[PDB]
Structure formats: structure tokens, C-alpha cells
Amino acid sequence: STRLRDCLSNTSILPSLTTFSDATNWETVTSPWALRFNPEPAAVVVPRNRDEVAAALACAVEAGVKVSPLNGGHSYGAYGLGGVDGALVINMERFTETTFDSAKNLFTYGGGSRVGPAATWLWENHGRHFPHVRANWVGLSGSSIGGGFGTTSRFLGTPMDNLDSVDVMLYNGTIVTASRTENPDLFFVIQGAGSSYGIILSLTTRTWKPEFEVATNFTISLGAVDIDTGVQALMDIQEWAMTEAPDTFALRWQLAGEWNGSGYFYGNPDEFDALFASLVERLPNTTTTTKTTADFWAMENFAAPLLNGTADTFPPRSMYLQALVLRKDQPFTFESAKALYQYTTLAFNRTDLTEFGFLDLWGGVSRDVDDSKQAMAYSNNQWLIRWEGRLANGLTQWPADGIEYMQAGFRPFKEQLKKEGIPLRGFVNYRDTELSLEEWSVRLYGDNFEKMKRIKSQLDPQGVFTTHAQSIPSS
Numbered sequence: 277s278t279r280l281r282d283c284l285s286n287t288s289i290l291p292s293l294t295t296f297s298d299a300t301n302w303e304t305v306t307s308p309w310a311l312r313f314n315p316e317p318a319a320v321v322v323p324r325n326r327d328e329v330a331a332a333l334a335c336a337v338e339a340g341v342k343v344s345p346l347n348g349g350h351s352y353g354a355y356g357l358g359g360v361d362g363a364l365v366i367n368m369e370r371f372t373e374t375t376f377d378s379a380k381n382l383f384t385y386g387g388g389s390r391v392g393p394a395a396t397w398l399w400e401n402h403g404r405h406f407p408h409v410r411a412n413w414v415g416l417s418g419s420s421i422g423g424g425f426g427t428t429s430r431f432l433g434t435p436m437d438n439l440d441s442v443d444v445m446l447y448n449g450t451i452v453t454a455s456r457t458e459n460p461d462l463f464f465v466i467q468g469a470g471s472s473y474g475i476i477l478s479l480t481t482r483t484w485k486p487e488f489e490v491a492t493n494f495t496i497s498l499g500a501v502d503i504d505t506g507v508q509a510l511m512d513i514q515e516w517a518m519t520e521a522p523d524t525f526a527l528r529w530q531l532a533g534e535w536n537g538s539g540y541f542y543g544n545p546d547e548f549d550a551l552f553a554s555l556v557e558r559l560p561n562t563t564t565t566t567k568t569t570a571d572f573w574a575m576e577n578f579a580a581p582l583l584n585g586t587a588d589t590f591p592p593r594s595m596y597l598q599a600l601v602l603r604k605d606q607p608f609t610f611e612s613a614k615a616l617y618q619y620t621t622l623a624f625n626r627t628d629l630t631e632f633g634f635l636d637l638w639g640g641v642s643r644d645v646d647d648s649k650q651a652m653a654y655s656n657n658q659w660l661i662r663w664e665g666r667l668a669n670g671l672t673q674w675p676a677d678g679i680e681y682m683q684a685g686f687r688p689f690k691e692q693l694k695k696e697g698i699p700l701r702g703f704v705n706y707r708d709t710e711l712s713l714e715e716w717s718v719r720l721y722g723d724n725f726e727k728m729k730r731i732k733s734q735l736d737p738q739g740v741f742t743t744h745a746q747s748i749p750s751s
């Protein structure tokens with residue numbers, strides 16, 4: 277460690293903000309949100325300004341160690357701590373500047389920001405919104421580089437595609453601005469795989485002023501129904517969602533916790549009742565619903581508790597997540613939906629694990645996405661499907677067969693997709709840590725992967741940012 281320590285000790289980074297394993301706070305600074313993992317960094321530093329980021333990077337280059345920026349710490353694979361052991365972790369926590377350009381209605385936030393503080397700042401100062409993940413303390417950099425999905429994404433897009441530009445430090449300390457029209461190759465890979473290419477110092481997002489002061493939420497409960505009835509209900513919901521629903525709806529249909537759903541509507545609250553009537557039309561006669569209204573920012577805080585708070589709503593968790601997407605051209609069939617429900621939630625039976633999962637309705641403005649325009653493949657996404665196992669309360673050891681148990685229940689669904697000729701596709705932020713390179717690369721990036729590897733060779737030839745297991749290799 278001597279080389280890295282001595283180099284860092286000659287920078288201006290505070291000694292109190294430079295930690296190695298002999299530090300009194302090492303265990304705290306290296307603790308992962310994803311408790312199934314425990315990556316061991318070479319060191320963790322907290323830069324106070326852009327020059328200190330560059331100084332830390334230069335020390336990593338001189339020492340021959342990899343570099344991982346740490347933002348909100350939410351990675352489902354502990355990727356911010358490097359994923360693999362031995363990275364220099366650059367904790368971006370001080371980079372929380374917030375500015376608003378009222379001429380262009382663009383919000384600029386620092387590369388170490390979290391969803392809640394930044395959304396709260398923009399709301400309280402300007403009455404504006406940008407799509408964001410549904411959790412108060414997730415990093416904005418770490419979530420925006422993997423698409424993201426929020427309650428407003430069916431009409432506003434993803435956190436990722438609402439980015440207008442970013443400022444990025446490359447491995448050699450050079451700072452560039454990336455956008456669709458400036459350093460487009462870098463912007464391409466930021467939009468899906470940013471951790472493999474640079475350190476995002478600042479991000480600028482488009483923003484939306486809500487048209488209506490009041491928003492609506494709702495629930496749907498089918499009651500005690502059999503599998504065929506529940507599956508038919510999903511098919512009927514899907515048909516409504518693909519033919520009648522406006523883009524301003526959101527809907528989550530439970531996988532674990534069936535047969536129930538919930539959602540939001542961001543159009544005129546006086547138009548909701550007629551739209552909700554059309555949705556519940558075919559549902560079985562045991563169905564009941566609820567509806568409420570609240571002002572826009574109150575609703576935001578009900579969807580993501582404590583957006584304006586001071587602590588994470590979601591404590592660290594030992595879990596294993598899997599996730600697939602379906603597109604508009606090949607959505608659920610009766611057979612594929614039945615395979616999913618029959619062998620995941622309806623067969624789940626463990627004392628040491630609990631089940632979690634849902635189907636988030638997509639569609640809407642995913643119709644405007646082109647896969648050739650950014651690394652992440654997500655054009656015409658129609659559903660986001662999440663199936664997750666969580667360690668039971670009171671246990672501390674993830675079971676040796678937990679991954680196999682979770683994968684087995686989700687396998688009949690995959691086989692039915694294969695039978696129907698439907699590609700297996702994923703969603704970057706919902707990292708499945710058990711996938712092989714052959715699997716994650718095509719599921720996340722489709723046929724963009726070769727281009728991504730070329731850009732990797734061009735922008736990080738020495739591999740400084742090659743850290744976690746899903747890092748983009750060079751060509």
C-alpha cells in the first residue's frame with residue numbers, strides 16, 4: 277500500500293478524508309448496502325474539488341490500481357466500492373452543487389448527489405421535477421448511468437435520457453463535457469455503462485413543471501382468485517395499457533403479493549375516474565379499488581418516502597435480484613405470464629428467504645427510443661419484471677443455495693420466452709450479478725456491445741475504470 281499512501285499523502289486531500297485499512301473508520305466507510313457482498317478497496321478518499329479528483333486519479337495511475345467512484349452506495353452488486361477487491365474508491369459525497377438555468381429550464385447537480393436532496397431542492401426552489409428512481413437516497417450518478425425508471429417515466433422518459441449533458445473526468449485527469457452533440461461516443465457509453473469510462477463530476481437534466489397541482493394514486497385488488505383468473509386479469513390490464521392508457525399513468529402489478537396493483541396518474545385529476553373505469557372493465561367481479569389525491573410534491577413523497585428527509589428509507593439488505601424486460605412487439609402471453617406466476621410466487625416456499633417482486637408497466641414514450649443512440653438497449657420496452665429473494669429477518673448468512681432457488685423459479689418464464697422466440701433482455705440498474713458476460717452484455721446492450729468495447733479501448737486504454745464484474749472490456 278506504500279506507494280498509493282505516499283502519493284495520496286502528497287496531494288491536498290485531507291488526511292482525515294484519506295482512509296486505508298488502518299483507519300479508525302475503515303469498516304464504516306467500506307460497508308456495502310448490498311450485504312451479500314463485501315469488496316475490499318485499496319483505499320477510500322473524499323475529494324473536495326475537481327482538482328482533488330484528478331490528483332486521486334493520478335495516484336491510482338502511478339500505483340497501477342483501478343478506480344471506482346462511489347455515489348449513493350445502492351448498487352445491487354456493491355459496484356461503487358469496486359465490485360472486485362483492490363480499487364481506489366473516490367467517494368463523491370461532497371459534489372452536491374445545485375443550480376438552475378431558468379432560460380433553458382435545465383437543472384445542474386453535482387456528481388455525488390442523491391435523489392431526494394436534489395429533487396427536494398428543485399421542487400422547493402423552482403416547482404419542477406425530473407424523472408428519478410423510486411427511492412430517496414439512491415445516487416443520481418449511479419442510477420442515471422443505468423437508465424433508471426420512475427413513476428413519471430412513461431411520459432417523461434428515464435433519468436438517463438432526461439440528461440442533457442454531463443461533465444466527465446477521464447482516466448488522465450482530462451475533463452470533457454459529453455452530450456448528444458459533444459463527445460458523443462462518451463455520452464453514448466455514459467448512457468448505460470458510465471462507471472467503465474470516467475468520473476462524472478456534474479450532470480445537467482431537463483426538467484418538467486407539472487401541469488396540474490394535484491396527482492392521483494390508486495390500488496387494485498382482485499381478491500381470492502385462481503391462477504388462470506389472475507393471469508387473464510394481467511392480460512386484460514396489458515391490453516388496456518397498450519391501447520387505451522395515456523402516457524401519464526404509472527402502474528405496478530405485484531409478482532410477490534399478488535393479485536394486486538397500484539399506480540399513479542399525472543394527467544388532469546378530473547379525467548382519472550373515466551380512465552380508471554376503463555381499466556377495471558374486464559377485471560373479475562371480486563375486484564375492489566381505492567383512489568386518493570394529493571398535491572404533486574406530497575405525492576412524490578408518498579411514492580418515495582423521505583425524499584425531503586435526512587436518511588435512507590431502505591437499510592442495507594442481503595438479497596439477490598433478477599430482472600427482465602419485455603417490449604411492445606412481444607409482450608406477455610397467457611402462457612408466459614402463467615409460467616412466471618406459477619413457478620415464482622405461487623411456488624415460493626422458504627423459511628430463510630422472503631420473496632419480493634413486481635411488474636412495472638413501461639411503454640409510453642419508450643416508443644421514441646432508438647437503441648442506436650445510446651449504449652443501453654431499451655427501445656419500446658413495455659414491462660420491467662423484477663424477481664428478488666431477501667434474507668429473512670434475524671439471519672446474517674446468505675444461504676449457499678439461495679441463488680439457485682431464486683433462479684429455478686424464474687426459469688420456466690425464460691423457457692417460455694425462448695419457446696416464443698422472444699429475446700432475453702435486461703435493465704441495467706437491475707443488475708443480475710450471477711450472469712455471465714455472454715448473458716449480461718447482450719441482455720443490457722443488445723448489439724451495441726462491440727461499439728462500447730471500441731469506445732473503451734479509445735477512452736480508457738489502460739483500463740483504469742475496469743472494476744466490477746459487469747465492466748465493459750476493451751475491444
Ligand SMILES: *Cc1cc2c(cc1C)nc1c(=O)[nH]c(=O)nc-1n2C[C@H](O)[C@H](O)[C@H](O)COP(=O)(O)OP(=O)(O)OC[C@H]1O[C@@H](n2cnc3c(N)ncnc32)[C@H](O)[C@@H]1O
Nearest residue numbers: 347348349350351356409410415418419424425471476590
Ligand atoms: C438500493 C436501491 C436501489 C434501487 C432502488 C431502491 C433501492 C433501495 N430503486 C430503484 C428504482 O426505483 N429504479 C431503478 O432504476 N433503480 C433502482 N435501484 C437501483 C439503483 O439505481 C442502482 O443500484 C444504482 O446503480 C445505484 O447507484 P448509487 O450511486 O446509489 O450506487 P453506487 O454503488 O455508489 O454506484 C453504482 C455504480 O455507479 C458508478 N458511479 C457512481 N457515481 C459515479 C460517478 N460520479 N461517475 C461515474 N460512475 C459513477 C459506481 O462506480 C458504480 O459502478
Ligand SMILES: *[C@@H]1O[C@H](CO)[C@@H](O[C@@H]2O[C@H](CO)[C@@H](O)[C@H](O)[C@H]2NC(C)=O)[C@H](O)[C@H]1NC(C)=O
Nearest residue numbers: 492493494538539567568569570575578579580
Ligand atoms: C397514496 O396517497 C395517499 C395520500 O392520499 C398516501 O396516504 C398516506 O399513506 C401513509 C402510509 O404510510 C399513511 O401513514 C398516511 O396517513 C396517508 N396520508 C394521508 C393524507 O392519507 C399513500 O401512501 C399513497 N400511496 C402510494 C403507493 O403512493
Ligand SMILES: *[C@@H]1O[C@H](CO)[C@@H](O)[C@H](O)[C@H]1NC(C)=O
Nearest residue numbers: 573574575577582583584585
Ligand atoms: C416533506 O414534504 C412533504 C410534502 O410537502 C411534507 O408533508 C413533509 O412535512 C416534508 N417533510 C419534511 C421533513 O420537511
Ligand SMILES: *[C@@H]1O[C@H](CO)[C@@H](O)[C@H](O)[C@H]1NC(C)=O
Nearest residue numbers: 622623624625626627628629
Ligand atoms: C414448504 O416446505 C416445507 C419444508 O420446509 C414442506 O414441509 C412443505 O410441504 C412445503 N410446502 C409446500 C410444498 O406446499
Ligand SMILES: *[C@@H]1O[C@H](CO)[C@@H](O)[C@H](O)[C@H]1NC(C)=O
Nearest residue numbers: 446447448450734735736737
Ligand atoms: C486523455 O485521454 C483521453 C481519452 O483517451 C484523450 O482523448 C485525451 O487526448 C487525453 N489527454 C491528454 C493526452 O492530455
